[PDB]
Coordinates of C-alpha atoms in Angstrom, one line a residue:
X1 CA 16.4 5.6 2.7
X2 CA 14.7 2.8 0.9
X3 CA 11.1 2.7 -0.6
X4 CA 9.5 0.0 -2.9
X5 CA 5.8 -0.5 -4.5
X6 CA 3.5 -3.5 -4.0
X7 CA 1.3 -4.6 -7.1
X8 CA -2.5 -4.2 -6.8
X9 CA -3.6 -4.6 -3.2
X10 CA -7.2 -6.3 -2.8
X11 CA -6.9 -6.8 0.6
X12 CA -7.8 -2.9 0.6
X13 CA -10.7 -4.2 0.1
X14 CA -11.7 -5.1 4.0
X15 CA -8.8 -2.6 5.4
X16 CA -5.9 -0.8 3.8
X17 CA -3.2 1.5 5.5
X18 CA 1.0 0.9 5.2
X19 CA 1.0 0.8 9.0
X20 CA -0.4 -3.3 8.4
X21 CA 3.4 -3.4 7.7
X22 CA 4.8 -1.1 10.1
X23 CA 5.6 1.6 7.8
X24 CA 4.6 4.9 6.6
X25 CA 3.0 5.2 2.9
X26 CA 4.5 7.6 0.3
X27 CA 2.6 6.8 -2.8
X28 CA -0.2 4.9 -4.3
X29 CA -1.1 3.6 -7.9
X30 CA -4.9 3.2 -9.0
X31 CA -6.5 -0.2 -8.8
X32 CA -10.1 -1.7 -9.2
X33 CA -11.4 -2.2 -5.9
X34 CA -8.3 -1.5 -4.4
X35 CA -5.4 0.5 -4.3
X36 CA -1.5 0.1 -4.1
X37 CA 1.1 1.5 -1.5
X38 CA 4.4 2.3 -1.2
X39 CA 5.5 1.6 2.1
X40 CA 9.2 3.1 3.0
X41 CA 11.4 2.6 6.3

């Protein structure tokens, strides 16, 4: 049980989703452009 934010993700931008990392998202923060999220497990 672990979960932890990334700053302000442009790379949204083209293509977003946690599953890039192999995890499921839990929250997000608001960004220009972009937008944040936390990935978890």
């Amino acid at each position: 049980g672990v979960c932890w934010d990334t700053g302000c993700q442009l790379n949204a931008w083209a293509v977003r989703g946690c599953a890039q990392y192999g995890m499921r998202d839990v929250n997000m923060k608001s960004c220009s452009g972009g937008i944040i999220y936390t990935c978890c497990d």
